[PDB]
Write an enzyme that holds these catalytic residues in place. Structure first.
Site, short mmCIF file in Angstrom:
data_model
loop_
_atom_site.label_atom_id
_atom_site.label_comp_id
_atom_site.label_asym_id
_atom_site.label_seq_id
_atom_site.Cartn_x
_atom_site.Cartn_y
_atom_site.Cartn_z
N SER A 79 21.36 0.61 -10.16
CA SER A 79 21.58 1.16 -8.75
C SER A 79 22.96 2.32 -8.89
CB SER A 79 21.95 -0.03 -8.10
OG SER A 79 21.61 0.25 -6.73
N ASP A 116 10.52 0.63 -5.33
CA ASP A 116 11.83 0.62 -4.63
C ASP A 116 11.57 1.37 -3.27
OD1 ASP A 116 14.71 0.64 -4.32
OD2 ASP A 116 14.84 0.78 -6.49
N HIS A 162 13.48 -2.87 -5.49
CA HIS A 162 15.11 -2.67 -5.92
C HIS A 162 15.23 -3.60 -7.12
CE1 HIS A 162 18.60 -0.15 -6.02
NE2 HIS A 162 19.35 -1.45 -5.63
#
Lengths: 833, 833
Positions: free
Chosen positions: A691, A769, A801
């Site tokens: 991320s 995602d 995610h």
């Protein structure tokens, strides 16, 4: 020195090693204390908590009136019970719930009614009311429904535990669990209609507020019921109504890949319109017998934009405990102006079509009734939303007292007792004008600071305060004793001074205080010891109730004890050239050969709202950083500037400058180590993160070809112009007022800066995602292809995610080791160059 | 036998090597002959043709009445002219157009009117009509419009060249190009309504018909105009009308990656519904002034399911030369039953809303009037559709003579002169039943095979037949002399004797024969010589009109000469254990060494409808196979059973068995080569193909995990249940009756069969691929992760099925070479194991 080379395992041998190390290996939460009030019996309290046995259900344990202070009492877990939609799968991503079963519950101290969703069903049992305390698992009672779709976000009515509310198809419903009566309160969303046509919802928090403000509910029961003349009552539900018609529409792949379709999705891209929001209120008239007389639906007397000029996000909302006012914390779009606002139900008029009937109802409402801004703060940095806000019983009609927390005065989050004068407004609607900026603001009678120092109170991820209105105390969680340890504290709010700590040093504590303030529960750990949950009793010396001390009472969860096969990392610190102390973790390689240097793998996050380096057990989550050390990699982790738990100054360091400061701290710390340990091979340094961590992994490889041999970026944010408003604008502002900051912080805008050697860049992404869309990766790849640069790419097609499917997690670990081995540690890697 | 190892160039070095060789390096087509009729002029004909100057546009050359035979004449090209939407971009993918400018054009023999689309514009010029011949470029006359969006598929009315038709938002429009009058003929599609709720079209070929039946049009002008009493006339248009309402909807990524949205489009997945289709006709009544009087729209007197029981696809359609009947070739869904059919305009009644006036209209049409099936054939392999079909002027009004081609009779495609009797049918609408499947069938008076033998007539990809009705000859292209060369043949259709070859052996020719049958143009090449284009004159001894002789007349395009820095491959052959001869192409590694064995790369396709090995120039298309030979790789290409140009039995080899046979042939020929030439290292063999080629690459790596070291699968079909109806069912049949076939031919259903060593599998895919949807790759990755198998992936987010963006091509060749070098060719690659 002389280079160490890692052993060359085959893909099948690495799969074996990883499976063997993993072949071994959720703690209690949502605690509630309930008195037995039974003189004869040996138990003072019953505690209920959620926990994993497997599935997640309600348990209970028995708090005894006394203990054998010779021995340790370990409380036994009695089971209380006897037993995914695209709404469930998306919400459980926004909360980051990894568990399955009961995620949360709701209780009525009066009735003893538990209310909880469990799969597609809503259930209710009783315990600890007038009906006594079970001695064996209870069989739940399913709530009956005519509704055809999954019921989300059930809540008991605090004023009447026969009545529950829930969301079905983006409208609020109420159902009576004794009378089996059901009723729809809002007719805002046609479920048969398509995405683009409707785009409206009531009682639901929109995407940004679940992702970036961790607020999941959008309707609130009024805690008190008002009596009708003939022995009935009125119930009230405050709710937010959303219109996302202007919000941009994203498509993201449907998980069932066989369909080859996408799901429509409202995503406020940075710069675009957020959803249009206003408050509403259902008045529900009940007759004496418990059936619905009538449901009035009420709107604000004037528009939302007019009453709350400048407000964009409804960060938080609820009711004063009297039931007198509905309160709300409101942010402007820049997230620099926060306001606490009281809202009388008298501001809500019934919704009418007739223009002449509304102008009649408007006239009825007095000019005295007006929104009351009891608090307002501003910051040159940003406002961090928290869950701390306590309203006291009202003594005079014209004052409200409350405790709130702010980083705005000191640069550090502290509690403040505030009294606000509820003055009548300068502005009258009679005049027919739009009110001035300060026309609703209340004078501040007193602003007493309960805490202060170069440390902060915590109010996120379930950290909060607990007020003892008898002893005039407030318990809170803080970094006063250290930035690496969270601890429980208590302090008088009347005459504040000394701040008594209640948790033992050498441990980081997550704490929960009984509603009766006579017990607390600590989930504590440190670098070497896995998490334990223990229950401590609070008593006061009989000469001074203001003074509080703890006594260990019973264990709820015993640790497995220093896990074998796991070598913990040693924390370190270093003075930056920026004049801050930065902390780090170092995993020295196992079996350290003297006269040898090893390849160094820097794991990173480096984003805001996070701290990786603290005195907690990293054996569960970061077990594979240990495994890397066991294969002969140095593993380094550094909390750079912008990390949380260090005050606002520290955090605001990368305002407008995302991706331009974090790596210089990673390298400053990476060199402080190299200068101190000749076993760090600076010629073979790799960087990996997920991320924001995956973002900085790509910044590390552009900015510093020299330091970092290989970057492994997972779900990287390549393009801030695509992330959501709530987050991006909080740190980077509007992309018009930061043209350059958005350019320099977007790695896909800078593909020419990537290396022209292969075996340096590896990109990982969840194909589905919905948070960091896969187009971050698909659009960077586009510019790498134009720039004739090379990349390596792993897609995880079933993952969003997070990584939930374990087959995926195993492949990620297997590939990551093989990749570092093949392109960093092993002999063959040094030959490739 | 010493192993050779390829020079390890760096990524930047290899990019230079390719850019240097790429620094080095379209022929004319759509020819048309117009007679000058200048008895005093020096020119017999003027030829018109499309070619690249740069843009692709119309040119003309002059044909001399006479030539100096001593010297060669090279015709100078005179320019005739004075100088993408979403639906024009999809058409170019379906047609596989690479070129920009004018793709096709029309010509009205009588008037000299050209008509052509060019970008969004539609233009006309006049040349060669009554108004004589330009000596200087003409200026294109824009057909003006009120139509908002782009116009697709313009066609000149042959019955009046003032009128044209075109498609706009899936409806047929007509536009007069002197009165500028513009009329919309169909009201079937709302451009403003969403495609999910609309999905209806008129005058357009649906996706499968363009992709799998190479038919790009769905409307046809009637070529004669009926006269009126007042002095006007009735023009007619036959058109297919589709309804895709029941066709599965798929979402492909929008090419504007910034939007993160997906385009909906209708994909008939194997076994799901094809669009509901029917014939319709627009009667346009025009006055003597040329203004439109009225427009009647007409539907079949009975539904398409009744009149044409069994027909799934309308394959081809049109009018007979007099326009008495409209004709249509019609397939059953399994594509084992071709019907030819004549449909009188009298079968079409006005479309009426009234239920009682429609009944009066039905009975008004004679019961004699009925569809006429004039030819039906069936095969237990399958029907290959083709553009060969010729109807002779009608002599007896109850008979029709025509020429068709069929593999069903002999096992090879041959011409047949067929007379069919138009006997009025037994079925009557008065009786009011449905007809038996034999009620419209026609008796077959004669059926004289014009050709026969173990070699096919060609009728796909522009190959067709010119028919001399004066001398009663038919010119055609065929594989009689060889499968590795296409040649031009001529033969009588009256007394079909022997077949005179007109092209010279040693080359492969695509040919194009003057409508007057007194000239022909050949585009020809062989393995060593780039494509030439010459003009030949046809001549007959006045004693015998059948005897046909050619004579060189002029160069249209001179060869570029034998290209330097390109060694051609040598064609080979081998007796298969299956009994068939298979051909191949060997690129020996340039600058061979004695005693040394070399790494080998097998390029493959192996699908149906395609032959890669033949005596044509590969220096343009497969230039990089030679670039692979120049680096040290042996390069091998084999046409396994299934590939085209070898009869229906050779092709039918893999009916229901796709994937199961092809590699056995590829490995047989690889071992044949290994025995004769000892430079072929069989311990270092890679395989690489695109689409079906990439599919077989994945099958080779599963099936022969021993022969093949690496496989590089481009845009590969991994799941036949995902591919479209018209292709998959043609070979694999419906999936519910060939359940084992679909399982064994689908690599993603068998992910456990893949290697557990890395650096052996490379998946390449266009991210926006709308033909082999990227889900083939993403779902295979899904199963490879479950199975714990390693893979390498490269995406091309700009590209669809082809590779158009030149930067995407440069990156593909550069990665392909580096992956081969680092994982097959070099010494470092031998160390990796």
């Amino acid at each position: 020195l002389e280079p160490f080379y890692v052993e060359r395992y085959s893909w099948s041998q690495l799969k074996k090693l990883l499976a063997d190390t993993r072949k071994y290996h959720k703690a209690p939460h949502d605690f509630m204390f309930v008195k037995r009030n039974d003189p004869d019996g040996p138990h003072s309290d019953r505690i209920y908590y959620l926990a994993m046995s497997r599935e997640n259900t309600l348990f209970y344990s028995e708090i005894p009136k006394t203990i054998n202070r010779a021995a340790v009492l370990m409380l036994s877990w009695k089971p209380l019970l006897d037993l995914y939609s695209r709404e469930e799968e998306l919400l459980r991503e926004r909360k980051r719930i990894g568990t399955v079963g009961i995620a949360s519950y709701d209780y009525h101290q009066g009735s003893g009614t538990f209310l909880f969703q469990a799969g597609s069903g809503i259930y209710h049992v009783k315990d600890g009311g007038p009906q006594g305390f079970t001695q064996q698992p209870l069989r739940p009672n399913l709530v009956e429904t005519s509704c055809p779709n999954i019921r989300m976000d059930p809540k008991l009515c605090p004023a009447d535990p026969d009545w529950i509310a829930f969301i079905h198809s983006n409208d609020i419903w109420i159902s009576n669990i004794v009378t089996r009566e059901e009723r729809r309160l809002t007719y805002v969303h046609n479920e048969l209609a398509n995405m683009e046509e409707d785009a409206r919802s009531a009682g639901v928090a929109t995407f940004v507020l679940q992702e970036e403000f961790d607020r999941y509910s959008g309707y609130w029961w009024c805690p008190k019921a008002e009596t009708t003349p003939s022995g009935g009552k009125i119930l009230r539900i405050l709710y937010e109504e959303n219109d996302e018609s202007e919000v941009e529409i994203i498509h993201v792949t449907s998980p069932m890949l066989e369909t080859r379709r996408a799901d429509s999705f409202r995503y406020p891209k940075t710069g675009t319109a957020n959803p249009k929001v206003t408050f509403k209120m259902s008045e529900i008239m009940i007759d004496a017998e418990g059936r619905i007389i009538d449901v009035i639906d009420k709107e604000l007397i004037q528009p939302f934009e007019i009453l709350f000029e400048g407000v964009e996000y409804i960060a938080r909302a609820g009711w004063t405990p009297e039931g007198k006012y509905a309160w709300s914390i409101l942010l402007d779009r820049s997230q620099t102006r926060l306001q606490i606002v009281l809202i009388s139900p008298e501001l809500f008029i019934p919704v009418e079509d007739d223009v002449m009937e509304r102008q009649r109802l408007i006239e009825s409402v007095p000019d005295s009734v007006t929104p009351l801004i009891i608090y307002e703060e501003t910051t040159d940095i940003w406002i961090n939303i928290h869950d701390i806000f306590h309203v006291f019983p009202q003594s005079h009609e014209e004052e409200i007292e409350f405790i709130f927390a702010s980083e705005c005065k000191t640069g550090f989050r502290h509690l403040y007792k505030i009294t606000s004068i509820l003055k009548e407004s300068k502005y009258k609607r009679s005049s027919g004008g739009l009110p001035a900026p300060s026309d609703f603001k209340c004078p501040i009678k007193e602003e007493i600071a309960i805490t202060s120092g170069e440390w902060e109170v915590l109010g996120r991820h379930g950290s909060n305060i607990q007020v003892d209105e008898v002893r005039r105390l407030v318990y809170f969680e803080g970094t006063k004793d250290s930035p690496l340890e969270h601890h429980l504290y208590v302090v008088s709010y009347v005459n504040p001074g000394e701040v008594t700590r209640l948790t033992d040093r050498g441990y980081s504590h997550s704490c929960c205080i009984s509603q009766h303030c006579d017990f607390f529960i600590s989930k504590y750990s440190n670098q070497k010891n896995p998490h334990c949950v223990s229950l401590y009793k609070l008593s006061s010396p009989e000469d001074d109730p203001t003074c509080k001390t703890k006594e260990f009472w019973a264990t709820i969860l015993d640790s497995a004890g220093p896990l074998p096969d796991y070598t913990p990392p040693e924390i370190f610190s270093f003075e930056s050239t920026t004049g801050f102390t930065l902390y780090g973790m170092l995993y020295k390689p196992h079996d350290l050969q003297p006269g040898k240097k090893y390849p160094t793998v820097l794991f990173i996050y480096g984003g805001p709202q996070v701290q990786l380096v603290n005195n907690r057990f990293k054996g569960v989550k970061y077990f594979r950083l240990n495994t890397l050390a066991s294969l002969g990699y140095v593993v380094v982790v550094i909390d750079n500037r912008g990390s949380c738990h260090r005050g606002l100054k520290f955090e605001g360091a990368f305002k407008y400058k995302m991706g331009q400061i974090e790596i210089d701290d990673q390298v400053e710390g990476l060199q402080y180590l190299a200068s101190r340990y000749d076993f760090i091979d600076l010629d073979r340094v790799g960087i990996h993160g997920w991320s924001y961590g995956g973002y900085l992994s790509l910044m590390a490889l552009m900015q510093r070809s020299d330091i970092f041999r290989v970057a492994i970026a997972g779900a990287p944010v390549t393009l801030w112009i695509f992330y959501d408003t709530g987050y991006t604008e909080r740190y980077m502002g509007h992309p018009d007022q930061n043209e350059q900051g958005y350019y320099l912080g977007s790695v896909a805008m800078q593909a020419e800066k990537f290396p022209s050697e292969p075996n340096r860049l590896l990109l990982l992404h969840g194909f589905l995602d919905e948070n960091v869309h896969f187009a971050h990766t698909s659009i960077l790849l586009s510019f790498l292809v134009r720039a004739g640069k090379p990349y390596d790419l792993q897609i995880y097609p079933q993952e969003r995610h997070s990584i939930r499917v374990p087959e995926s997690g195993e492949h990620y670990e297997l590939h990551l080791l093989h990749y570092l081995q093949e392109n960093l540690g092993s002999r063959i890697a040094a030959l490739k160059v």
